[PDB]
């Protein structure tokens, strides 16, 4: 069996901390990269941020540019997703994906993601 | 390049006795997707074919 | 017309296909005078491959 959860999320106030967190089953973050994505209503999925697989370098969106920081455990196949700075608009509905395969490097356009998490909300309020 | 189109127009350059610049190509932003298969990106600086 | 030594034959070869491999140094320009008499040049080349 191969699914997928997610925690974190909810309601934090403007400017505060949020931290997102997700796991995977039947498949390891090391041999398969781990991508983010945030969708709004009436709207397509777009991207936020991932980490690469080598876990060398991350890469952030450009409205949340140098904010975030992602760190990830291999020994319990778990995510760590810290949000900083947090704005109303940053309000959407993210989810916890992996890549289709394991193959190296990172990919945040396009669906390359065949496996989707829960679609946990994020809002922001002041 | 301003030739860019579509699938359809398939294409192939060989190109040889060059020094690249992976590690620029690996770091840029304006690249939406860099996947790699068979080579870790780091790795693949080192190593070449 | 020009009454100077030029280039206006090429018969090297006749096609050229399938290119893997280029390289040309700097431009310039050789005297093609019809010189007579002993020679002032000797030129030695080794190829190994």
């Known amino acids: 069996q191969v699914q997928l959860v997610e925690s974190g999320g909810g309601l934090v106030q403007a400017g505060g901390s949020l931290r997102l967190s997700c796991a995977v089953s039947?498949?390891?973050?090391?041999?398969?990269?781990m991508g983010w994505f945030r969708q709004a209503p009436g709207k397509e999925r777009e991207f936020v941020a991932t980490?690469?697989?080598?876990?060398?370098?991350?890469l952030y969106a450009d409205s949340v540019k140098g904010r975030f920081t992602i760190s990830r455990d291999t020994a319990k196949n778990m995510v760590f997703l810290q949000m900083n700075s947090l704005k109303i608009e940053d309000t959407a509905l993210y989810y916890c994906a992996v890549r289709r395969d394991s193959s190296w490097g990172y990919s945040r356009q396009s669906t390359e993601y065949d496996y989707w998490g829960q679609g946990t909300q994020v809002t922001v309020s002041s | 390049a301003t030739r860019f189109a579509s699938v359809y127009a398939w294409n192939r350059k060989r190109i040889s006795n060059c020094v690249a610049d992976y590690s620029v190509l690996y770091n840029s932003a304006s690249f939406s997707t860099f996947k790699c298969y068979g080579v870790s990106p780091t790795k693949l600086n080192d190593l070449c074919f | 017309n020009n009454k100077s030594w030029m280039e206006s034959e090429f018969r090297v070869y006749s096609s050229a296909n399938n290119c893997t491999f280029e390289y040309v140094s700097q431009p310039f320009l050789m005297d093609l005078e019809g010189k007579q008499g002993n020679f002032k040049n000797l030129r030695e080349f080794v190829f190994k491959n």
């Open positions: 980490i690469t697989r080598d876990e060398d370098m991350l």
């Open positions: 039947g498949r390891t973050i090391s041999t398969f990269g």
